[PDB]
Amino acid sequence: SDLGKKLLEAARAGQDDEVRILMANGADVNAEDWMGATPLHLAAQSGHLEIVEVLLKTGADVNAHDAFGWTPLHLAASQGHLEIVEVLLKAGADVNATDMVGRTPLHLAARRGHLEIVEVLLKHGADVNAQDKFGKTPFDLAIDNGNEDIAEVLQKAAKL
Ligand SMILES: [Cl-]
């Protein structure tokens, strides 16, 4: 609980050595804060790859959802952290997991303009036709945000 609180913020801040000490001293790797974020969520969101790999190696739940439904893959796709996206997928992250608004990681990558992430999620079986609670596909979010290259790629993937 107490070390868990410290682990969350050391993961967010990229404090590799502190993460390691906290885990060796028994910090709960799946500790949650007020919004259900776990250390893996915060490391994946803030782009700290080594810490993501350490947490995965010592039992972090790769498919944990926070209070908003976001999984660590949602957060890394949204924030554009490609290597972390790949490690999470390799650790078994659900490529088509959905959040509170029905969005998948591909929705968020398209909304945020992250073409490399879009291309990698597609090659790992992301659902181009998934519809969020607003009735929007990833293609719709690419158009809404003026991301024409992502939109063209998503079109080609839907066609074939
Ligand atoms: Cl684009």
Author numbering: 2 to 161
Quote the study on this structure.
Here, we report the selection of designed ankyrin repeat proteins (DARPins) recognizing mTFP1 (monomeric teal fluorescent protein 1). Here, we report the selection of DARPins recognizing mTFP1, one of the brightest and most photostable FPs in the blue-green spectrum. We characterized these binders both biochemically and biophysically and determined the three-dimensional structure of one DARPin-mTFP1 complex. The two DARPins we report here bind specifically and with high affinity to mTFP1.
The complex with DARPin 1238_G01 did not crystallize, but the structure of both isolated DARPins was determined as well (1238_G01, 1.6 Å resolution, R/Rfree of 16/18) and (1238_E11, 2.1 Å resolution, R/Rfree of 17/21). Of these analysed clones, only two candidates, named 1238_E11 and 1238_G01, showed a specific binding to mTFP1 while the majority of previous hits seemed to also be interacting with free streptavidin. For DARPins 1238_E11, a high affinity with an equilibrium dissociation constant (KD) value of 3 nM was determined, while the affinity of 1238_G01 was found to be lower with a value of ∼88 nM. Anti-mTFP1 DARPin 1238_E11 and DARPin 1238_G01 differ in 13 out of 21 selected library residues, suggesting alternative binding epitopes, in line with the ELISA experiments. Despite having different binding affinities, both DARPins, 1238_E11 and 1238_G01, bind in a very similar way inside the cell, suggesting that both affinities are sufficiently high.
